[PDB]
Amino acid sequence: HMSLADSVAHLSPERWEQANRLLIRKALAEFAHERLITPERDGDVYVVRSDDGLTGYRFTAAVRTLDHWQIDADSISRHRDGEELPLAALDFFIELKDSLGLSDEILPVYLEEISSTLSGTCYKLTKPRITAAELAAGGFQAIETGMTEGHPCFVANNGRLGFGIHEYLSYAPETASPVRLVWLAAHRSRAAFTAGVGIDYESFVRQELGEETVDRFHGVLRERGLDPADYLFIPVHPWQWWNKLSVTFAAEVARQHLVCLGEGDDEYLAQQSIRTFFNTSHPEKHYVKTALSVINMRGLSAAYMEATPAINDWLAQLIEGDPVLKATGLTIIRERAAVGYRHLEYEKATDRYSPYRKMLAALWRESPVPSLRDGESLATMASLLHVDHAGASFAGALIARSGLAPAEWLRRYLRAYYTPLLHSFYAYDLVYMPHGENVILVLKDGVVERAIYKDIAEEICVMDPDAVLPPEVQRIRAEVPEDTKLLSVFTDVFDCFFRFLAVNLASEGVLEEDDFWRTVAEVTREYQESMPELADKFRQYDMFAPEFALSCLNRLQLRNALQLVGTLRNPIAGF
Amino acid sequence: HMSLADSVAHLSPERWEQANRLLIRKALAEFAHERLITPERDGDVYVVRSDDGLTGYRFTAAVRTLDHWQIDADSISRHRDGEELPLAALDFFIELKDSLGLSDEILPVYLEEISSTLSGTCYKLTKPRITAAELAAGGFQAIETGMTEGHPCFVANNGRLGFGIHEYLSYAPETASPVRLVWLAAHRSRAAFTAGVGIDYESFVRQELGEETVDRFHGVLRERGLDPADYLFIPVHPWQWWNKLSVTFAAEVARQHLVCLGEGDDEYLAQQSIRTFFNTSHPEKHYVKTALSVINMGFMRGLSAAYMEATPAINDWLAQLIEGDPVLKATGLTIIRERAAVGYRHLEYEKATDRYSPYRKMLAALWRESPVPSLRDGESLATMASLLHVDHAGASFAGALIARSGLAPAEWLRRYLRAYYTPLLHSFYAYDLVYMPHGENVILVLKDGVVERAIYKDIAEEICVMDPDAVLPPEVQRIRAEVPEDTKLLSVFTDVFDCFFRFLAVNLASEGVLEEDDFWRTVAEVTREYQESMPELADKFRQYDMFAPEFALSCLNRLQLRNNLVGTLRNPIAGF
Ligand SMILES: [Mg+2]
């Protein structure tokens, strides 16, 4: 941000009321889904009352599959003492403090998170109007940075707390501001580099930075009388350097355990994960995931980091060695190298969970771009839930561009993304956290050719504690209750992603809900019928059970161990 | 900080070693004074060992009056397993974690505060290494920004946590970086202005900003369609605007409860109170004290609107009290009054919080009179903290004033005491009135090196009348308190003698300017000279005996190491 006026230009009364209307609509919809509130009918209108009962929220809505509340945002009115009141998200959460589990200690910081979400919405409303169809054809990073919703379940989901407004405008992914990494040299008595198969440190940094920059960086070390052979390069988010490391790790800088090397040349864009950077100067080079000590202090831990490339190499060999997965086109983009720093004094003074141990670390992830064949393009799977200012579905614009039948388009999408989740569960007892942000879709002519998974090591799990795995990999084992294993599919895919996709394709008039879930059931049976030898597992974990548990995402957020209250009708049980 | 190399240029191995040695010297000295550690004499050296015994710190020292440990910084050595090790402040506190009461939870944040303290010392070591005599001749703000010690008792004292390094380099007092304030218009439904006697809001802001700036700001409100009469002006620290208010109070900006007016034109310097600004473009104008949500020991500071409605009236009362007392008027004592205050009330955070939440201390400001227009010919201004200042070569700023004055040291001291100390004694005995009388909230007026008179500041939040039944105005009755009788006099013995005179006596004794016994003999004489001038308070002099043999050792570092009295000290006025 340059001037004082520009710093708050996005905050206008009009944009604010629109942002408050959209957030309250989502709060009402997802709080009702999670049975934290229970709207009552009154005529052709639903009503939700505050704790005290003196304030009423009235709206029109239709309940859809999986208890999805489809609320008209323009129908929402707020009433008290027979007087209509403006919509105000902050008042809304205060008035339902007790209905939501908001402790006295969490409510103020929750409101701050809401103010930041509302502010980001205000900023996004200042961005040029772009339609769904124009967004489909706009490019990988135009799609990444053109997302407005964020996670579709969490009400407080786009909080950039810890960023001043100038830093929000420089670093938030929706601003599409170019970012340059700061590079430190870390002494090898305190830093360690871990690489996957085929990676050599000296050639790795040469490929990433180019030899001219590497030699310039060496000159900084030698000008101080230091030997480059004793040091490792660590890339650092500028916010982390200026606001944290330069002060908190001052002792490491002064003693030359860390040396500030300079800025890197290449321009990067923050992704939806704000600490993960895509290289736009060189899209073929690695993503860089950085440590970022902002609170929800968060960061990136150096502990679990030593095995991360090996877990990625393991899973890649697993997909290649399996014709069922290779036939879906499933690939991952591997975490390929990692570097971690050990602040020995903070280590002595802290336990393993302290944010002082997550302040300096990075990892590198393969770019999906060199895998692209002719006419293929990249889109975050999150984009399938995007809706433009006119109410058009991004997924709809893809179906129209494909000229395919909607159910046929959907079947190809499910073959590429959904089928491999089933095989991983039944063949290998293997699950992910397969939400929108950690899946990249490959599109040709509007059609999903294949899927790419990312964010592997921190997310994958084998639900067999006595399964044969390499030593570096064994740590991804766990014992999961038999009743809960299958929620990996119902919660994370059905209730947290398809629920929204099916409602949006129906609302647009593209595909009825029944056909959507029919198609889902067809594809599940197709995979089932193709693997008879796994039938013992299909019976013990039935995808077609009539009900499964309702896992509530906002409830977990309002606590600071899953939050299961009640059950949902399984959409595929009668197909 | 523009450049990436400029962001850490102050951090060099040599300055860091120097800063670690100095901080360890102070920690050993003040921890031993508070009896947190007990050095053992091992021949001609003292020894302090880590909690486990594996590490030893060896140093020569002399124990001076009031159990002051004068340690030679260059004699400190660290030893483990028959090897001599480099001094490392962070290791020092981890090794003594249990002796010091550092719990598991606050130890990490304590070490971060120490790092900040150490970084600031490194920064200060890159400043021109100016001499005590030169600094004495340097003018009011050169002295203010040239202080290096900070509080003389607290080991972790100059932490600027919450600032990035670029922010430290723009805003910390020791950088002497000009700062322009940001001005907000706050709607009168959520903001309130409070004035002292003779203050009118419209003339007040016209004086401070000038008509041109004031019309430019009214313009900003008109283009938005707003009525300036519905708004109050609030100046804000730029760090506070960019890092806190524009994000946390976004609802107030959007709904136009707050409106960003722009940047004031006058250049300010941060004082040793980093949230308080002196106007360099017009030194006659008021100090501006702003809300600043930085961190102190994990806790978010700021400026609250709670006791804000009565801060001017408290200052008006104290000023009138001084003007009306012949004893105080004879010492020349004055105050620079907090004259006007303004507060904002974020109603939504109010519903969500209790009285003590940092969300209520985020937007408020007050104005303090400048001492500059009081100055007569040859008069200059110096923070009283500068009496403890020692330059790079070890020369005392006070000794430099003594040398410039041409007076015998005891006589120079006697005039300083009559100027600053006599009013404290009189305040306590005549009115049961005490202050927070430390170096940063007293300003000295100097003429030809001599202390002509003293000026107090930081009044409302610090003053206390130890009498529940004392006659006071309604808005001023809040400063009353009932504290135990054996505690009342500690406000002199602790805050004056043990936290300030202890250091000044040792500094003048180290320079060969004044022996410790002659220092305290002079304090005693000034004490008796005051008592002999007020025989009608004689019974009080004996109820609260300034000449008692001992007083309680109050331990300032003990408090800070707990986020919240052990033994006694011989009162330096024995047979004196
Ligand atoms: Mg900042």
XYZ file of C-alpha atoms in Angstrom, chain B residues 31-572:
542
model
C 20.188 -10.292 40.390
C 22.741 -10.303 43.223
C 21.258 -7.066 44.554
C 17.833 -8.712 44.603
C 19.392 -11.835 46.166
C 18.167 -14.041 43.325
C 21.763 -15.266 43.098
C 24.462 -15.261 45.764
C 28.014 -14.843 44.456
C 30.636 -16.766 46.415
C 34.032 -15.167 46.932
C 36.826 -17.454 45.624
C 39.970 -15.513 46.523
C 40.103 -12.165 44.739
C 37.137 -13.099 42.498
C 33.430 -13.824 42.922
C 31.723 -16.888 41.445
C 28.110 -17.525 40.352
C 27.231 -20.997 39.158
C 24.451 -22.350 36.989
C 21.597 -24.216 38.615
C 23.325 -27.549 37.929
C 26.846 -26.413 38.848
C 28.373 -27.259 35.479
C 28.786 -23.621 34.421
C 30.585 -20.936 36.441
C 30.646 -17.146 35.934
C 33.730 -15.516 37.447
C 34.227 -11.795 37.910
C 35.774 -9.182 40.153
C 33.376 -6.893 41.991
C 33.078 -4.298 44.722
C 29.922 -4.144 46.827
C 28.956 -0.479 47.320
C 26.267 1.281 49.365
C 22.739 -0.226 49.259
C 24.181 -3.617 48.258
C 25.194 -2.276 44.861
C 27.406 -4.748 43.003
C 29.886 -2.778 40.894
C 31.199 -5.499 38.555
C 34.077 -4.952 36.120
C 32.496 -6.025 32.826
C 35.833 -7.019 31.304
C 36.628 -9.413 34.159
C 33.587 -11.645 33.530
C 34.494 -15.097 32.262
C 32.399 -18.202 31.665
C 33.694 -21.708 32.480
C 32.480 -25.286 31.883
C 34.482 -28.555 32.095
C 37.867 -26.865 32.475
C 37.342 -24.710 29.346
C 36.665 -20.966 29.064
C 33.508 -20.247 27.031
C 32.076 -17.195 25.265
C 29.525 -15.110 27.129
C 25.980 -15.775 25.893
C 23.104 -13.927 27.545
C 20.464 -16.385 26.337
C 22.368 -19.368 27.771
C 22.873 -17.399 31.011
C 19.122 -17.171 31.636
C 18.409 -20.765 30.647
C 21.202 -21.925 33.002
C 19.658 -19.951 35.891
C 16.034 -20.607 34.892
C 15.047 -22.099 38.246
C 16.993 -19.662 40.450
C 15.231 -16.854 38.587
C 11.688 -18.232 38.746
C 11.388 -18.367 34.955
C 8.500 -20.781 34.418
C 8.384 -23.027 31.329
C 5.830 -20.771 29.691
C 7.459 -17.367 30.038
C 11.115 -18.420 29.571
C 10.775 -18.409 25.736
C 9.201 -14.954 25.670
C 11.742 -13.688 28.204
C 14.552 -14.823 25.905
C 12.861 -13.027 23.020
C 12.731 -9.832 25.106
C 16.425 -10.204 25.930
C 17.229 -10.677 22.219
C 15.348 -7.463 21.465
C 17.247 -5.721 24.252
C 20.523 -7.077 22.833
C 19.670 -5.997 19.258
C 18.896 -2.493 20.460
C 22.237 -2.312 22.235
C 23.932 -3.381 19.006
C 22.000 -0.672 17.172
C 23.022 1.924 19.757
C 26.683 0.892 19.397
C 26.586 1.988 15.742
C 25.554 5.495 16.720
C 28.364 8.108 16.890
C 30.083 7.238 20.227
C 29.367 10.713 21.809
C 31.004 11.974 25.018
C 29.151 12.834 28.170
C 30.353 16.442 28.080
C 29.343 16.855 24.419
C 25.922 15.296 24.996
C 25.364 17.646 27.928
C 25.726 20.594 25.524
C 23.546 18.970 22.832
C 19.998 20.271 23.490
C 16.814 18.691 24.810
C 16.080 16.057 22.161
C 19.729 15.115 21.555
C 19.821 14.093 25.221
C 16.431 12.320 25.006
C 17.478 10.197 22.014
C 21.044 9.713 23.250
C 20.148 7.654 26.303
C 21.374 4.073 26.129
C 20.753 2.370 29.474
C 16.991 2.534 29.856
C 15.671 1.635 33.287
C 18.685 0.940 35.570
C 17.158 -1.998 37.508
C 15.299 -4.064 34.899
C 17.563 -6.414 32.979
C 15.027 -6.978 30.169
C 14.177 -3.314 29.784
C 14.318 -2.068 26.177
C 12.245 -4.685 24.386
C 10.455 -3.388 21.299
C 8.634 -6.633 20.530
C 5.902 -6.222 17.935
C 8.096 -4.061 15.707
C 9.670 -5.630 12.691
C 13.233 -4.531 12.165
C 12.095 -1.931 9.592
C 9.621 -0.638 12.168
C 12.255 -0.591 14.914
C 14.486 1.466 12.630
C 11.712 4.015 11.966
C 10.094 4.265 15.365
C 12.429 3.391 18.242
C 13.478 6.483 20.266
C 17.222 5.819 19.933
C 16.984 6.051 16.132
C 15.797 9.699 16.311
C 13.770 9.156 13.120
C 11.221 11.923 12.352
C 7.654 10.597 12.519
C 4.500 12.184 11.072
C 1.251 11.332 12.811
C -1.821 9.908 11.102
C -5.114 11.698 11.812
C -8.514 10.015 12.080
C -11.959 11.547 12.273
C -14.016 9.568 14.795
C -17.802 9.813 14.994
C -19.155 11.355 18.204
C -21.434 8.356 18.844
C -18.273 6.342 19.580
C -15.695 8.989 20.551
C -15.369 11.490 23.365
C -13.081 14.452 23.971
C -12.124 15.744 27.413
C -10.443 19.071 28.119
C -8.666 20.770 30.998
C -9.343 24.305 32.205
C -9.025 26.865 29.431
C -9.241 24.297 26.605
C -11.828 24.626 23.847
C -11.885 21.798 21.315
C -12.118 23.929 18.168
C -9.390 26.392 19.122
C -7.288 23.546 20.533
C -7.191 21.637 17.251
C -6.851 24.848 15.240
C -3.742 25.750 17.264
C -2.169 22.309 16.844
C -2.882 21.774 13.142
C -3.412 25.279 11.760
C -6.453 26.409 9.803
C -5.049 25.127 6.494
C -4.651 21.551 7.704
C -7.994 21.700 9.519
C -9.818 22.773 6.362
C -8.083 20.092 4.294
C -9.422 17.542 6.789
C -12.963 18.966 6.784
C -12.744 18.650 3.020
C -12.059 14.925 3.317
C -15.297 14.541 5.297
C -17.358 16.667 2.880
C -16.458 14.645 -0.231
C -17.720 11.584 1.651
C -20.910 13.532 2.471
C -20.239 13.773 6.213
C -20.832 16.566 8.710
C -17.523 17.550 10.378
C -19.511 18.621 13.449
C -20.289 14.907 14.041
C -16.605 13.917 14.283
C -13.634 14.327 16.615
C -9.984 14.346 15.502
C -7.729 11.577 16.835
C -3.995 11.444 16.019
C -2.576 7.948 15.784
C 0.821 6.289 15.614
C 1.508 5.191 12.008
C 2.446 1.713 13.240
C -0.952 1.559 14.989
C -2.815 2.623 11.835
C -1.131 0.260 9.380
C -0.768 -2.798 11.592
C -3.853 -2.612 13.855
C -6.643 -0.142 13.155
C -6.969 -0.607 9.385
C -7.521 -4.333 9.963
C -9.027 -4.786 13.410
C -11.318 -1.738 13.242
C -12.170 -2.286 9.554
C -15.868 -2.254 10.430
C -15.473 1.274 11.817
C -13.650 2.510 8.699
C -16.171 0.953 6.303
C -19.242 2.291 8.132
C -17.506 5.695 8.415
C -17.398 5.622 12.211
C -13.702 6.324 11.551
C -12.365 8.232 8.561
C -8.708 8.483 7.581
C -8.055 12.216 7.320
C -4.384 12.074 6.335
C -0.928 12.793 7.672
C -0.140 15.787 9.839
C 2.585 18.121 8.619
C 4.708 18.482 11.805
C 7.684 16.150 12.377
C 7.745 14.410 15.779
C 10.379 12.460 17.697
C 9.493 9.450 19.809
C 10.535 9.963 23.423
C 11.847 7.229 25.718
C 8.135 6.488 26.112
C 7.995 5.157 22.558
C 4.268 6.042 22.289
C 4.837 9.704 23.260
C 5.877 12.250 20.618
C 7.629 15.609 20.964
C 6.976 18.099 18.160
C 10.267 19.120 16.558
C 8.739 21.406 13.912
C 7.024 23.471 16.629
C 8.518 22.627 20.039
C 5.990 25.001 21.654
C 3.190 22.620 20.658
C 1.907 19.729 22.737
C 3.363 16.297 23.191
C 1.082 13.681 21.623
C 0.747 10.358 23.478
C -0.760 7.670 21.241
C -2.171 4.168 21.544
C 0.383 1.570 20.488
C -0.477 -2.149 20.615
C 3.045 -3.574 20.958
C 3.952 -6.470 23.288
C 5.716 -6.248 26.670
C 5.893 -9.752 28.190
C 3.493 -11.565 25.920
C 0.896 -8.869 26.781
C -0.488 -6.286 24.312
C 0.006 -2.710 25.563
C -1.866 0.397 24.397
C -3.766 3.415 25.715
C -7.147 2.890 27.388
C -10.177 5.200 27.457
C -11.194 4.177 31.015
C -9.527 6.647 33.400
C -9.235 9.024 30.413
C -12.249 11.222 31.229
C -10.561 12.564 34.390
C -6.886 12.771 33.364
C -6.975 16.567 32.682
C -8.827 17.267 35.948
C -6.200 15.300 37.907
C -3.477 17.469 36.293
C -5.415 20.686 36.966
C -5.765 19.681 40.600
C -2.059 18.915 41.001
C -1.034 22.144 39.254
C -3.313 24.204 41.501
C -1.948 22.340 44.535
C 1.613 23.344 43.585
C 0.693 26.947 42.803
C -0.953 27.156 46.233
C 1.897 25.806 48.392
C 4.768 28.157 49.358
C 7.162 25.243 49.992
C 6.669 23.734 46.541
C 6.702 27.123 44.794
C 10.053 27.855 46.484
C 11.600 24.714 44.956
C 10.487 25.890 41.519
C 8.521 22.688 40.994
C 6.145 22.622 38.035
C 4.355 20.021 35.975
C 3.613 19.737 32.298
C -0.097 18.955 32.395
C -1.934 16.452 30.312
C -4.328 19.080 28.904
C -6.710 17.174 26.582
C -7.620 13.544 25.963
C -9.725 11.724 23.384
C -11.014 8.165 23.419
C -12.780 5.825 21.047
C -15.300 3.162 22.092
C -15.611 0.152 19.788
C -19.032 -0.986 20.942
C -18.883 -4.451 19.390
C -15.587 -5.365 21.030
C -16.967 -3.894 24.267
C -19.841 -6.402 24.217
C -17.352 -9.197 23.552
C -14.712 -8.301 26.166
C -13.971 -7.424 29.782
C -12.557 -4.156 31.100
C -8.897 -5.223 30.740
C -8.882 -6.543 27.144
C -6.340 -5.031 24.710
C -9.247 -4.450 22.298
C -10.358 -1.516 24.497
C -6.924 0.151 24.526
C -6.459 0.460 20.762
C -7.593 4.011 19.901
C -7.065 6.949 22.267
C -4.692 9.852 22.605
C -3.757 12.618 24.961
C -1.885 15.893 24.702
C 0.708 17.201 27.161
C 2.024 20.781 27.521
C 5.529 21.434 26.194
C 8.130 22.585 28.763
C 9.926 24.647 26.110
C 8.002 27.959 26.473
C 8.766 28.072 30.234
C 12.504 28.359 29.509
C 14.253 31.625 30.417
C 17.615 32.844 29.130
C 20.315 30.206 29.238
C 17.891 27.510 30.411
C 17.880 24.072 28.737
C 16.024 20.797 29.253
C 17.342 17.310 30.103
C 15.572 14.097 31.098
C 16.524 13.170 34.656
C 17.429 9.722 33.302
C 20.501 11.424 31.838
C 21.966 11.722 35.338
C 22.652 7.972 35.195
C 24.021 8.073 31.672
C 27.596 6.934 31.126
C 29.281 7.399 27.771
C 31.471 4.891 25.911
C 34.602 6.011 27.820
C 32.930 5.647 31.230
C 32.387 9.351 31.999
C 29.199 10.334 33.842
C 26.748 12.791 32.322
C 26.161 14.092 35.859
C 29.902 14.576 36.360
C 29.951 16.550 33.118
C 27.208 18.826 34.452
C 29.141 19.240 37.711
C 32.293 20.161 35.797
C 30.409 22.659 33.627
C 28.760 24.294 36.651
C 31.953 25.193 38.484
C 30.350 24.185 41.789
C 31.709 21.775 44.348
C 29.981 18.412 43.723
C 28.101 18.334 47.012
C 26.777 21.834 46.286
C 25.767 20.863 42.760
C 24.017 17.863 44.314
C 22.385 19.982 47.013
C 20.721 22.135 44.363
C 19.551 19.090 42.403
C 18.118 17.621 45.629
C 16.300 20.838 46.611
C 14.876 20.910 43.071
C 13.677 17.303 42.726
C 13.830 15.536 46.126
C 12.518 18.186 48.524
C 9.122 18.370 46.715
C 8.803 14.566 46.997
C 9.359 14.682 50.758
C 6.967 17.597 51.111
C 4.367 15.895 48.908
C 4.521 12.744 51.059
C 4.393 14.462 54.442
C 2.094 17.419 53.718
C -0.366 15.681 51.360
C 0.258 11.897 51.624
C 1.036 12.269 47.921
C 3.479 10.061 45.978
C 4.401 9.651 42.317
C 6.147 7.192 40.050
C 9.340 9.248 40.510
C 11.739 7.596 38.072
C 14.145 9.030 35.524
C 11.875 8.998 32.478
C 9.043 11.044 34.017
C 11.120 13.944 35.416
C 12.608 16.720 33.262
C 15.453 18.838 34.613
C 15.915 22.517 33.768
C 19.601 23.369 33.551
C 21.316 26.749 33.585
C 25.117 26.767 33.280
C 25.233 23.075 34.206
C 23.180 23.626 37.408
C 19.737 22.169 38.092
C 17.510 25.246 38.462
C 14.224 23.363 38.857
C 12.475 20.097 38.033
C 9.384 19.362 35.917
C 7.211 16.306 36.571
C 5.168 14.444 33.950
C 3.257 11.161 33.591
C 0.916 12.320 36.336
C -2.572 10.822 36.166
C -1.653 7.151 35.793
C 1.044 7.338 38.470
C 0.017 9.603 41.353
C -1.520 8.332 44.560
C -2.843 9.977 47.727
C -2.362 7.506 50.598
C -5.361 8.751 52.572
C -8.915 7.484 51.876
C -10.408 10.541 53.638
C -8.429 13.341 51.933
C -10.385 16.296 50.497
C -10.418 16.019 46.687
C -12.642 16.977 43.739
C -14.998 14.209 42.553
C -13.099 13.388 39.366
C -9.850 13.431 41.414
C -10.998 11.162 44.308
C -9.960 8.079 42.264
C -6.262 8.627 43.158
C -6.845 7.759 46.833
C -5.714 4.384 48.199
C -5.286 2.593 51.530
C -1.848 0.953 51.736
C -0.251 -0.453 54.923
C 1.580 2.008 57.156
C 4.894 0.107 56.920
C 4.647 0.355 53.117
C 3.973 4.059 52.613
C 7.582 5.226 52.980
C 8.864 2.624 50.490
C 7.787 5.030 47.742
C 10.865 7.053 48.721
C 13.234 4.322 49.865
C 12.607 2.093 46.851
C 11.819 4.379 43.940
C 14.208 7.208 44.823
C 17.062 5.720 46.886
C 17.304 2.119 45.645
C 16.218 2.610 42.018
C 17.892 5.904 41.224
C 20.159 7.446 43.889
C 21.942 4.095 44.285
C 23.169 4.417 40.710
C 23.954 8.138 40.777
C 26.039 7.820 43.969
C 28.055 4.940 42.509
C 28.620 6.734 39.213
C 29.953 9.898 40.874
C 32.061 7.814 43.267
C 33.518 5.818 40.346
C 34.502 8.998 38.521
C 36.238 10.321 41.655
C 33.828 13.266 41.687
C 32.041 12.589 44.997
C 32.537 9.895 47.609
C 29.483 7.788 48.413
C 29.473 8.889 52.034
C 29.467 12.529 50.946
C 26.573 11.868 48.566
C 24.372 10.333 51.280
C 25.480 12.876 53.891
C 24.125 15.493 51.479
C 20.820 13.646 51.071
C 20.570 13.484 54.865
C 21.282 17.209 55.252
C 18.619 18.066 52.676
C 16.185 15.772 54.486
C 16.900 17.440 57.851
C 16.807 20.886 56.262
C 13.310 20.135 54.982
C 12.107 18.718 58.314
C 13.473 21.643 60.306
C 11.505 23.961 57.994
C 8.188 22.184 58.787
C 7.914 21.686 62.561
C 4.115 21.325 62.292
C 4.608 17.920 60.618
C 7.094 16.710 63.254
C 4.824 13.886 64.458
C 4.627 12.603 60.877
C 8.423 12.696 60.623
C 8.583 10.342 63.441
C 5.718 8.088 62.381
C 7.406 7.680 58.946
C 11.094 7.920 59.813
C 13.288 8.805 56.842
C 16.191 7.951 59.209
C 15.025 4.449 60.182
C 17.901 1.917 60.304
C 16.568 -0.365 57.557
C 13.907 -0.620 54.892
C 12.523 -3.466 52.833
C 14.433 -4.705 49.804
C 11.814 -4.451 47.060
C 12.790 -6.554 44.070
C 11.864 -5.239 40.614
C 13.266 -8.127 38.565
C 11.406 -10.625 40.793
C 8.123 -9.034 39.710
C 8.900 -9.034 35.975
C 9.986 -12.705 36.025
C 6.507 -13.630 37.346
C 4.271 -11.231 35.318
C 3.074 -9.821 38.646
C 9.761 -7.910 49.476
C 12.595 -10.218 50.603
C 15.002 -8.973 53.269
C 16.204 -5.509 54.176
C 18.733 -2.877 53.118
C 20.654 -0.619 55.505
C 19.251 2.892 55.018
C 22.133 5.020 53.639
